[PDB]
Amino acid sequence: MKQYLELMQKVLDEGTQKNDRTGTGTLSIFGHQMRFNLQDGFPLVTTKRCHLRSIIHELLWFLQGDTNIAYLHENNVTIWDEWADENGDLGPVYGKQWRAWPTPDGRHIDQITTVLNQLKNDPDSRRIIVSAWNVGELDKMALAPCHAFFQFYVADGKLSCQLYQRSCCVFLGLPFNIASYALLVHMMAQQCDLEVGDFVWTGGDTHLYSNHMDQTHLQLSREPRPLPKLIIKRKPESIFDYRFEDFEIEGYDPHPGIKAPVAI
Amino acid sequence: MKQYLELMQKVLDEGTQKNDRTGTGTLSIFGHQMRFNLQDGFPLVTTKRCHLRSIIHELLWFLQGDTNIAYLHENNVTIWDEWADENGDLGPVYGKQWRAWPTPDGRHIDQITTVLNQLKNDPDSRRIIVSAWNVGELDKMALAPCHAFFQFYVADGKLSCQLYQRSCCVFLGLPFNIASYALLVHMMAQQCDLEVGDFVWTGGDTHLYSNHMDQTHLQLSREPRPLPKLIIKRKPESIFDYRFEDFEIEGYDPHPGIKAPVAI
Numbered sequence: 114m115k116q117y118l119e120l121m122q123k124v125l126d127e128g129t130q131k132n133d134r135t136g137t138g139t140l141s142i143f144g145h146q147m148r149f150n151l152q153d154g155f156p157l158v159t160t161k162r163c164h165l166r167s168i169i170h171e172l173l174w175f176l177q178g179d180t181n182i183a184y185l186h187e188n189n190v191t192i193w194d195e196w197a198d199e200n201g202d203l204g205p206v207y208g209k210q211w212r213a214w215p216t217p218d219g220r221h222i223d224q225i226t227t228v229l230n231q232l233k234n235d236p237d238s239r240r241i242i243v244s245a246w247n248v249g250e251l252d253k254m255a256l257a258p259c260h261a262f263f264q265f266y267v268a269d270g271k272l273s274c275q276l277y278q279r280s281c282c283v284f285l286g287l288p289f290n291i292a293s294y295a296l297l298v299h300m301m302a303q304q305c306d307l308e309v310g311d312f313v314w315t316g317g318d319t320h321l322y323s324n325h326m327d328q329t330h331l332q333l334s335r336e337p338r339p340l341p342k343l344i345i346k347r348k349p350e351s352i353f354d355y356r357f358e359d360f361e362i363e364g365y366d367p368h369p370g371i372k373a374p375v376a377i
Numbered sequence: 378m379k380q381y382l383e384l385m386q387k388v389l390d391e392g393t394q395k396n397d398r399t400g401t402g403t404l405s406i407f408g409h410q411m412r413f414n415l416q417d418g419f420p421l422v423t424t425k426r427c428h429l430r431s432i433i434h435e436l437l438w439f440l441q442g443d444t445n446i447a448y449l450h451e452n453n454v455t456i457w458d459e460w461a462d463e464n465g466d467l468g469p470v471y472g473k474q475w476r477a478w479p480t481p482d483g484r485h486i487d488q489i490t491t492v493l494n495q496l497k498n499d500p501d502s503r504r505i506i507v508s509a510w511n512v513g514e515l516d517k518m519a520l521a522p523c524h525a526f527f528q529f530y531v532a533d534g535k536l537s538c539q540l541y542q543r544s545c546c547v548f549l550g551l552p553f554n555i556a557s558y559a560l561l562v563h564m565m566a567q568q569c570d571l572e573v574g575d576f577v578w579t580g581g582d583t584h585l586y587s588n589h590m591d592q593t594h595l596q597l598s599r600e601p602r603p604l605p606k607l608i609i610k611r612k613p614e615s616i617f618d619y620r621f622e623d624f625e626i627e628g629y630d631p632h633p634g635i636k637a638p639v640a641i
């Protein structure tokens with residue numbers, strides 16, 4: 114899409130040559146923001162074919178508060194296998210923090226439940242937030258949260274959301290993170306009887322890995338196409354009752370997929 | 378400053394009306410990003426005379442890990458009075474989370490010292506973050522954090538910083554926050570022998586209160602003046618050893634001050 118393709122061009126033109134913890138190298142910029150009016154369509158990239166199957170199961174996985182790769186493997190979703198332990202645990206990552214943030218005194222906070230109730234009962238609140246950046250448990254996580262902080266906002270019966278991504282692999286992860294959250298917004302909006310608003314993406318270290326240069330140049334050649342439309346075919350009793358089948362993307366006519374190496 | 382004034386104009390041009398828990402009306406937009414090249418000068422508002430004394434003392438107070446206003450009173454800083462209890466306590470706000478975020482294991486994490494060490498030993502890290510948003514202790518705080526989370530970044534021997542402010546009172550609090558963090562960056566930079574880079578400001582619910590409209594337009598009719606210059610007259614042994622006298626602001630010729638009501 115326009116915004117995404119511009120971010121790619123920006124990294125290429127202004128990026129800085131940094132050496133990352135991988136050793137692979139990187140072109141990087143710091144601080145960037147894009148706005149996606151969800152009224153214009155689901156922000157799923159068209160200049161390259163992306164698969165929602167994994168994006169959806171991961172999100173539903175997150176909402177369960179599950180941090181064991183089990184559910185994902187049972188649905189043929191790899192993504193988190195390269196960081197899971199023997200048993201398939203990743204530590205108190207997204208999900209554990211979303212559904213059971215640990216207080217210093219033993220209790221547990223349910224941020225998703227809180228956010229739902231604030232949306233329904235105090236939509237004007239300026240502190241409707243979900244944070245995965247739990248400092249006290251970062252050392253117990255298989256990896257530090259990339260999409261670490263998000264805030265909801267209601268205005269004219271519309272639900273908007275801003276995500277703060279500390280680290281961003283522009284080529285591989287961004288398309289995935291964007292669709293993931295756009296998805297959540299729709300789910301929340303349906304559960305609270307609100308129209309969808311804007312999805313605002315904000316990133317910290319935004320980069321393109323060196324061995325992605327070819328792919329990026331290839332993708333920048335392709336013309337963006339009309340955005341598809343997300344369809345929710347059922348309104349569950351709660352935001353925790355959604356099932357994979359409930360979603361359907363209509364009108365998605367993307368350019369062919371582009372394979373690329375994942376630096377771990 | 379150009380960036381600041383354009384923000385105000387944007388809120389006024391694109392903001393929708395909302396009601397906050399203070400019973401006061403507001404004009405707000407959601408999601409915005411601002412950039413300040415610290416090498417251009419110290420980002421202190423000139424279209425309105427600002428008070429540095431308080432800005433500096435609050436910051437030192439934060440770095441000390443202090444959450445009681447006694448210190449602020451000794452130096453005659455009043456900014457926090459309205460929210461302190463009978464004993465001057467504000468609860469586990471900024472200072473406490475920064476210097477001693479409590480984990481569930483009974484440990485405590487000093488995030489400031491941590492980033493300092495990351496800045497010196499692994500400046501390329503994409504996890505140099507300080508968060509005051511402790512879901513577990515929000516209910517003990519006199520006020521939920523406004524400048525909630527910030528990330529550092531190094532490139533070309535320059536230290537940049539990005540702040541995420543969930544809620545922002547454009548006319549009254551923003552000038553304070555900008556200058557506060559710009560100061561933290563200079564200190565962090567001086568301690569790490571780095572040159573200052575950019576201070577990126579990212580806001581969530583950015584608003585102007587209904588009773589600030591006249592002052593806002595008054596200020597908006599003024600022409601920004603050249604940015605002042607910050608001069609540190611000493612290099613302390615640690616980031617925690619700066620005194621008020623170590624700082625000098627030169628070339629500050631602001632327009633007349635503009636008194637305005639604070640929503641509590």
Ligand SMILES: C#CCN(Cc1ccc2[nH]c(N)nc(=O)c2c1)c1ccc(C(=O)N[C@@H](CCC(=O)O)C(=O)O)cc1
Nearest residue numbers: 164165167168192282284285286287289290375376377
């Ligand atoms: C962001 C995020 C979550 N994540 C996590 C995640 C973790 C480490 C990373 N490391 C690097 N170098 N780049 C990344 O974008 C990245 C993303 C993802 C995991 C795998 C794929 C991936 O390789 N894509 C495959 C599979 C897609 C699918 O199964 O649906 C592809 O062919 O597109 C994408 C996103």
Ligand SMILES: C#CCN(Cc1ccc2[nH]c(N)nc(=O)c2c1)c1ccc(C(=O)N[C@@H](CCC(=O)O)C(=O)O)cc1
Nearest residue numbers: 428431455456457546549550551553554637639640641
């Ligand atoms: C940010 C922050 C810290 N804070 C804390 C803080 C806490 C709650 C808030 N609530 C609201 N409604 N607006 C705010 O900006 C705000 C700021 C401050 C508190 C007061 C002033 C203030 O009254 N402004 C006067 C100060 C005069 C003086 O120096 O004594 C001014 O005109 O500058 C500024 C900063």
Ligand SMILES: *c1cc(=O)[nH]c(=O)n1[C@H]1C[C@H](O)[C@@H](COP(=O)(O)O)O1
Nearest residue numbers: 239240521523524544545546550551
């Ligand atoms: C909070 C503290 C700060 O440092 N700076 C700020 O601008 N503020 C503002 C935001 C808002 O006007 C009010 C907080 O209200 P709430 O927590 O959003 O409900 O103070």
Ligand SMILES: O=c1ccn([C@H]2C[C@H](O)[C@@H](COP(=O)(O)O)O2)c(=O)[nH]1
Nearest residue numbers: 134259260280281282286287290503
């Ligand atoms: O949802 C995700 C997860 C990971 N990453 C990327 C960010 C970095 O490219 C790398 C993680 O590295 P560190 O930030 O921890 O160094 O994977 C994303 O872009 N999105």
